[PDB]
From a paper:
We expressed and characterized a putative sulfatase (PyuS) from the bacterium [name]. The PyuS protein chain has an α/β sandwich fold comprised of 15 α-helices and 13 β-strands that form two anti-parallel β-sheets.
Furthermore, we were able to obtain three high-resolution crystal structures of PyuS. However, with no sulfate substrate bound in the active site, the expected 2-amino-3-oxopropanoic has been oxidized to a hemi-acetal functional group. In addition, the analysis of the electron density maps, B-factors, and geometry of the metal binding site allowed us to identify Ca2+ as being present in the active site. The PDBePISA analysis of PyuS crystal structures revealed that PyuS forms homodimers. Dimers are also seen in the crystal structures, and PDBePISA shows that the interface area between monomers in the crystal structure exceeds the threshold to distinguish between real dimers and experimental artifacts.
Numbering used by the authors:
A (entry chain A), B (entry chain A): 1 to 445
Write the structure that this text describes.
Amino acid sequence: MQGSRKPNIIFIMADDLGWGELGSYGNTFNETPNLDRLSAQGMRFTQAYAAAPVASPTRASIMTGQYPARVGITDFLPEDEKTDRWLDPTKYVTLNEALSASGYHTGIVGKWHLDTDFKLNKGGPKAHGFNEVIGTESEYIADGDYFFPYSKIASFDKGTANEYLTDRQCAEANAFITRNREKPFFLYLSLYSVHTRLEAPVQLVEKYKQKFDQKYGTGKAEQFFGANNVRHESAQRDNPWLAAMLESIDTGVGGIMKTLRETGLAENTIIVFFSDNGGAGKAGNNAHLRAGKTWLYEGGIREPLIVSWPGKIKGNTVNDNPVTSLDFYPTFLAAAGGKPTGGRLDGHNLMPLLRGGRASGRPLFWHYPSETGKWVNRMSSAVREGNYKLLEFYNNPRLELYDLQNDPSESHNLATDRPAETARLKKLLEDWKKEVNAEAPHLAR
Amino acid sequence: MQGSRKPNIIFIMADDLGWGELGSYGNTFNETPNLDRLSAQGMRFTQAYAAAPVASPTRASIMTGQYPARVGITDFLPEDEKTDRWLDPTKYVTLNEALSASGYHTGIVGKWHLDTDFKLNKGGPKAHGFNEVIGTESEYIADGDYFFPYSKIASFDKGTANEYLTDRQCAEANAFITRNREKPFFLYLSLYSVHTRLEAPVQLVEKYKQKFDQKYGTGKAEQFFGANNVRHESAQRDNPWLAAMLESIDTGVGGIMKTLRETGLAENTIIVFFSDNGGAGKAGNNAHLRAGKTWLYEGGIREPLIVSWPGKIKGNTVNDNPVTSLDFYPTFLAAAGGKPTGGRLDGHNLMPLLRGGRASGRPLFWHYPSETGKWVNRMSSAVREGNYKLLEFYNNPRLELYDLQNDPSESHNLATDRPAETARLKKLLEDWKKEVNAEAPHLAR
Ligand SMILES: [Ca+2]
Ligand SMILES: [Ca+2]
Ligand SMILES: [Cl-]
Ligand SMILES: [Cl-]
Ligand code: NA
Ligand code: NA
Ligand code: NA
Ligand code: NA
Ligand code: NA
Ligand code: NA
């Protein structure tokens, strides 16, 4: 039946995918032709942030629209016996429920990581009200399992011989789109890829190993990524396993884009591609950015962000205004014609910015006390306002100030040379840490 | 040269050895004939405690004579990047320095676990003043390496093909005894065994596998401890790998006892055998005691304790008075004719008790906030006074009270039925936690 309907929202999030990985973000080794077509059909953000530098807190920021420091989940949820933390459906109106109240059918395909108690699982996605819960984790994901039968995903009881998980999750996405084509839907495609341990179909791995040898020389893939390298990790850039994993994601994104075109949903569907945190050490490519996952340096929090809404968002646009994972909740509620129902939202609606509007500066905040990883040298808090970023570190206590426009690699600390700017941002950070009751870092006495 | 000399002190400590493992503690599967001879030549303690339920804090209690909660090391030291904690030689007069000031030459053979920074290692045993430092760890021990070349022990640069670590450490003990026979010595024999991952010489493993099949039936060692069981762990009691590991320790203890007899040092040497914490889950045997390593239940803190001093300590005695790892510092200083030099000691000299004296009751305390393991259900504090033990748990907050004489397995909580005793011990525990500035547990908000 033809007639206007609220737009579908498809939120595709990769796990641990670095800012330097996509073709449109400058990578020449990986191949991401479908995501580069999505970029050509939409708006590419160069200064998009996860609200945390590890998995669970960024997922919490997306589902609650609140600072991870305010939620009290600032680090990943470990196995059940190592935490008492979980996201409680009675404490938050989650993004899926806000969209349900605005007329949407909701689904999650994949990773939740907001509850690691599987005995009761009172904070799993079904408990949060998702209408469809497809291949979510049934035990602690840990280093993962990417081939059927999926040891961490009991609910995928059926599958083909040696099926690859990214391919399964993308097929489930297309099927969800087809089953729900007559009504507004929200689909959270929460990929397990590219989380370690790296694993990809053999023929994709051999493709990128041959490409690596063409780039670096004969026998070099075997030299750096042979039998003896069990995790397929190294300090070497261009990771054939990551490239293979990313090709599977990219092909799956192409299948979703094709499904939208075939079902005649492409004109009335918003497609977002994002990542939950920065590239992982020894696996991921954060380009010139400093460090990666576990750090509040730019490499750990800067993420790929493509938003497409054909005919509403100008294609092949590049937006450098800073945005974060907190902004999806209000943006999607605006697209859905909904309004907050008393719940606090810590981000901002980007629909006016996506439509070509102007961006007012606002401060952005992070807090990483590393409650789970215990990474004492990474424990830090940060504020960005305009081009300046201030980090406070707790072990070796000190402030670091970067001008990210002139120093995007955070190689030249300005805190001593710009003491007034340092103090101005320090005051914003101190005030914010009070507002959110920021958890103290786990250090000695 | 003949003439009286202060007694030698040999402190032999197994890693993660359970109360239920030794022959003299009732085990009929393992074979510990040399340690059972040591028991027949000395005093066996049935109610001996580690001051903590994991490695580093108990080692801190021994070297400083202070409560782990007062030191601020109540959980194991993880890898360097996960901690800022270490034992500082400028904060404590350690037991080796107190004995050096009383005329002893000192040595450590083996595990330290009081500093995991190997870049500088300002808290390693050499920095603490040990005269000889033999085969201590040069990197984070983690799941260990028991065959030469020892991946965690660079300083054992020389060794025989496939040498086993327990055999090396016991040979180094005998050689240390022989080299220093003319003067008083303190030897800290800090074994890496029986820490997981379990590993023992093949012919010892096959001996205990055949013994397991005789006990349990044909093919049962292969059934429970075959190729498919990589860590050699199970819920099954009688672990052939643990039995093999313990035979190597026992044979080594016999070699030390023989070396003392041959060098004519046996009459003037105090030999202690102890363990740093309770048996490990799926590996160790804590007999009827509750739980094990990581818990403040009796299985995690009750340890084997044999003390021999021929002609001073009556042989084949059994002492049921409670004693802890805090008591070694004052006991050894009394044996050495030394006196504390301003340093606080939290235990008590047992020399009068070892000589046949009477034991006054005193309260004993534990604090386990699990700063490193993050084991939320194990987080607890405890006080024992007389036969009563009170535990306070922080997750699922509650008090548990046990009468350990009538309920040594801690199977019948009395806290509701004996409210006045519960309150009396609760007050001692609250006062103690204040005295030592007990670290709060790592829980949610
Ligand atoms: Ca992640
Ligand atoms: Ca231990
Ligand atoms: Cl537990
Ligand atoms: Cl680090
Ligand atoms: Na839990
Ligand atoms: Na809710
Ligand atoms: Na599998
Ligand atoms: Na460290
Ligand atoms: Na000292
Ligand atoms: Na080795």
